[PDB]
Amino acid sequence: MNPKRIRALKSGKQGDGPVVYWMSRDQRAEDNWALLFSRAIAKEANVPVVVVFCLTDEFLEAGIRQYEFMLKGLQELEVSLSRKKIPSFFLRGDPGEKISRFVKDYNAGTLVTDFSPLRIKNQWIEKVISGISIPFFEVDAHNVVPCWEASQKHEYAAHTFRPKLYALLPEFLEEFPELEPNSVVETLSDVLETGVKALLPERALLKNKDPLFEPWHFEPGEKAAKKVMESFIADRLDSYGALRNDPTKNMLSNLSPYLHFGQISSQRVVLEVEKAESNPGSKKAFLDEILIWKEISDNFCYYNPGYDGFESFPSWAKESLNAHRNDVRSHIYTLEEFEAGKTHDPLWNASQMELLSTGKMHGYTRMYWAKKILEWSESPEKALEIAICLNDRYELDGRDPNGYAGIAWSIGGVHDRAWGEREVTGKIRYMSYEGCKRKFDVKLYIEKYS
Numbered sequence: 001m002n003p004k005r006i007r008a009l010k011s012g013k014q015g016d017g018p019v020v021y022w023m024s025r026d027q028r029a030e031d032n033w034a035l036l037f038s039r040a041i042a043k044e045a046n047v048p049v050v051v052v053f054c055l056t057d058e059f060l061e062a063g064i065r066q067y068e069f070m071l072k073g074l075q076e077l078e079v080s081l082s083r084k085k086i087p088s089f090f091l092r093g094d095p096g097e098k099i100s101r102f103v104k105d106y107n108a109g110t111l112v113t114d115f116s117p118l119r120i121k122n123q124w125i126e127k128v129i130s131g132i133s134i135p136f137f138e139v140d141a142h143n144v145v146p147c148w149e150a151s152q153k154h155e156y157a158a159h160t161f162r163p164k165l166y167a168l169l170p171e172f173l174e175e176f177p178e179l180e181p182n183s184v185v186e187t188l189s190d191v192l193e194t195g196v197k198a199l200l201p202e203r204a205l206l207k208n209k210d211p212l213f214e215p216w217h218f219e220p221g222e223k224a225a226k227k228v229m230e231s232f233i234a235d236r237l238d239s240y241g242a243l244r245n246d247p248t249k250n251m252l253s254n255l256s257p258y259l260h261f262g263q264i265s266s267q268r269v270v271l272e273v274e275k276a277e278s279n280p281g282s283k284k285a286f287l288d289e290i291l292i293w294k295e296i297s298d299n300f301c302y303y304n305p306g307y308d309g310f311e312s313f314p315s316w317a318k319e320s321l322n323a324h325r326n327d328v329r330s331h332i333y334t335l336e337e338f339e340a341g342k343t344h345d346p347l348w349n350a351s352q353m354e355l356l357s358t359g360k361m362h363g364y365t366r367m368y369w370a371k372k373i374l375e376w377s378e379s380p381e382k383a384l385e386i387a388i389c390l391n392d393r394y395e396l397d398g399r400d401p402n403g404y405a406g407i408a409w410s411i412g413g414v415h416d417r418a419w420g421e422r423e424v425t426g427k428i429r430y431m432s433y434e435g436c437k438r439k440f441d442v443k444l445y446i447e448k449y450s
């Protein structure tokens with residue numbers, strides 16, 4: 001119940017109507033600070049709380065793989081909120097007009113949203129504040145430590161962000177109090193039915209018109225996310241430290257699609273892992289990625305308006321890449337050639353098949369995949385657009401602060417340091433095909449994804 005997690009977007013005349021939780025990033029009912037804080041305000045004013053989700057016109061920028069995963073979880077979400085006497089309303093259109101109309105139509109008293117540092121979220125908020133007079137609060141329900149409290153500036157390395165985040169852990173790492181039930185807009189299936197129809201022409205296929213995506217790797221919903229966490233801790237947490245860099249072994253947690261859509265709280269994952277009596281070396285490696293690297297991605301996007309642009313790169317990286325702009329590239333590939341996996345690197349290729357077929361590329365190959373796009377592009381800016389385009393289109397965890405921070409790490413050296421000076425790539429960290437062969441059995445990875 002710590003009120004540091006709450007930030008006031010606008011202070012207006014407090015209405016006497018239902019507290020509206022505008023759910024965007026954290027699509028879950030358990031372990032949701034935004035959902036709990038909305039219920040707290042509802043109790044204090046003796047008024048019910050409601051949940052509103054907006055289905056924006058931007059779903060056509062992505063594929064069916066992301067659309068189905070989000071909506072199937074929401075269908076489970078609606079029934080979960082119903083058993084807590086909480087009605088969920090699902091609107092279709094721009095949030096700027098849809099939230100404003102819903103606020104006036106339903107006589108909203110307090111408006112609550114979850115925190116997301118992405119530009120598109122800031123786009124909606126600007127419109128919403130321009131059409132309401134009721135108070136507007138936001139809650140960081142995605143980070144263990146609130147983004148504005150962990151640091152008040154951009155952090156240039158994990159070395160600097162780790163002590164600030166770990167010092168605030170004894171305060172913000174706590175259990176979740178129960179969501180007490182409330183005291184006392186057509187359908188979901190049809191929206192998903194018409195959404196798939198509008199996206200079907202853009203489906204990814206491989207020659208024979210057979211769909212490339214395989215939807216049986218990660219089931220959606222809050223329930224499935226919990227089982228994945230239980231599976232990871234019981235079976236793969238011990239070997240996470242020593243096998244996380246091997247793409248031939250499914251040793252990863254596989255929590256990112258649930259983490260991105262907010263189907264499971266990262267704080268819940270950290271709480272359970274801390275209780276687990278596993279390999280302390282593997283535990284330290286795991287908490288680094290879900291706490292340091294995950295929450296520094298929000299820090300990167302929150303304190304850099306141009307997080308997806310060349311301007312956000314460190315100065316040493318910008319000048320190093322600028323000094324190698326005119327170096328002749330060994331090869332140049334178009335976006336269509338990158339998309340289809342038609343490069344001269346069978347290792348880079350096979351990473352694309354895993355991305356296209358499963359929607360989740362291995363973490364280690366994600367670094368190789370992004371850095372080779374820089375090596376084989378006309379300019380670093382062109383590689384930035386290609387990497388963002390492919391990641392957001394085909395990753396189930398894409399369109400996330402982790403994605404923009406991860407690409408910025410691979411291409412622009414964000415949260416990194418200078419390495420040996422090479423041509424084309426400059427001082428950016430370089431990952432070689434020969435180097436990967438010495439780290440894992442590349443042939444097994446290639447044969448898996450042909």
Ligand SMILES: Cc1cc2nc3c(=O)[nH]c(=O)nc-3n(C[C@H](O)[C@H](O)[C@H](O)COP(=O)(O)OP(=O)(O)OC[C@H]3O[C@@H](n4cnc5c(N)ncnc54)[C@H](O)[C@@H]3O)c2cc1C
Pocket residue numbers: 244252253254255256259260289290291293294295297361362363364366367370391395397398399400402403404406407408409410
């Ligand atoms: C170029 C690039 C693109 C990426 N695209 C995305 C993205 O769009 N969305 C996304 O959520 N992840 C992205 N990843 C980050 C990371 O690769 C994934 O989080 C991870 O691979 C997801 O699979 P996992 O949960 O089984 O990994 P795990 O080893 O199980 O890690 C668990 C969690 O820690 C976090 N995490 C792990 N590695 C990183 C990292 N390098 N940076 C930040 N957080 C991390 C993730 O939340 C992850 O879910 C990207 C990284 C890079 C370098």
